[PDB]
Amino acid sequence: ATGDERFYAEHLMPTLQGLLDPESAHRLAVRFTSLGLLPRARFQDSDMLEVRVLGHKFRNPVGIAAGFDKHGEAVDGLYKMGFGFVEIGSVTPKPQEGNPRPRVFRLPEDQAVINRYGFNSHGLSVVEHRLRARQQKQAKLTEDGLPLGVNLGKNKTSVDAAEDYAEGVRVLGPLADYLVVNVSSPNTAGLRSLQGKAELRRLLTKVLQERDGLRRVHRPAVLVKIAPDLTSQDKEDIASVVKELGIDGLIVTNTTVSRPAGLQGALRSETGGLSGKPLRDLSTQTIREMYALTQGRVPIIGVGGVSSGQDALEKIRAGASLVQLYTALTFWGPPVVGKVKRELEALLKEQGFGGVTDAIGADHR
Ligand SMILES: O=C1c2ccccc2C(=O)c2c1nnn2-c1cc(F)c(-c2cc(CO)ccc2F)c(F)c1
Ligand SMILES: Cc1cc2nc3c(=O)[nH]c(=O)nc-3n(C[C@H](O)[C@H](O)[C@H](O)COP(=O)(O)O)c2cc1C
Ligand SMILES: CCCCCCCCCCCC[N+](C)(C)[O-]
Ligand SMILES: O=C(O)c1cc(=O)[nH]c(=O)[nH]1
Ligand code: NA
Ligand code: NA
Ligand code: NA
16 A cells, blocks of 8 residues: 555656656556556445445545546546546547647646646547446446446537537436536636526526436436636526526536646646646635535535545535545556545544545534
């Protein structure tokens, strides 16, 4: 455990990063993971890490965020890495290449990344067939407390965003435990403007109608993923629409187009979304706000700058029922998943919580 953790963190990852540009490193990471080339995590999930939410059991509350496995190529390897749930995507209706390279940048002095991938996607059909090939295996994983999420995007050239998302619901909804719609990615022109109210209500109404039209055993939960860059007005409006329509949950947050003071990385002024440590507390505060605006009745998946048990517990106590990480993986490697789970378990005990469920939203009480 702590042996692999230190080896990856101090030696192997700094070396990989010295040899490989970030996008090449990402591609290699997906390849290794899809082949299961990683230590089968020794950390046995204890009962106090179990969470029941979104109509499912989650064996542990630490998931892999969208954007690592964009095309559904490494799902089983990610469960092997120890994640309690996996979110693939974003997936767009038609295949598209995304932005010109370079489009991924490391800020090692900040333990941050900036990306402007631009929703590079193999497309719905390819991903549909990839998930169909392991559909029953996933059904068993889900039953064993390891659910699957699918994050849905829209094509750059799309005329009607709601129809892109509707297509995604129809094609991948039947293969997902939950679906995600972003009103929040920084690298598709106009996508975030889907955050405005009457239009947002229209969009989400259509998504939920399409979801409700699926057969019962193929009917996923629907979550909305938001950026940390919203105005107070935006957040109020989203909370209101979410409650009005019966949206099943929120993912809080995507990357930030802000550049917090104090960034040291040479590449800090590259265009794109910033992730990792400089996002951490901006994310946590957005969770805190959305939890309060929804009266703690809307499940939140908390994400942004998590790389320790303390980071995870801060988001849970702020209102998250589950958390995700991504950027920590790119600095610490696979051992970071077991690290976060072990540290989280220890902190729950230390603070007198019977388990994760007891800690959800505890700061508000
Ligand atoms: O800058 C980025 C980056 C930037 C943006 C997105 C992703 C990444 C990203 O994934 C990454 C970066 N630098 N290194 N990695 C990286 C992270 C890993 F976890 C592995 C890895 C290793 C093993 C060996 O057992 C097994 C499974 C693995 F995934 C890996 F090989 C490379
Ligand atoms: C390289 C990269 C690609 C991403 N791609 C997506 C994506 O396709 N869809 C999405 O909803 N979020 C995407 N994200 C955002 C992550 O899901 C997550 O919300 C964010 O990175 C914050 O978590 P972290 O600080 O642990 O990385 C991406 C993030 C990174 C770093
Ligand atoms: C309140 C705005 C603050 C913006 C971002 C804050 C970053 C906190 C620094 C701790 C991160 C640890 N490290 C190694 C990456 O520097
Ligand atoms: O594909 C991308 O550029 C991307 C999508 C998203 O939702 N978030 C992010 O940081 N990048
Ligand atoms: Na399935
Ligand atoms: Na389902
Ligand atoms: Na405002």
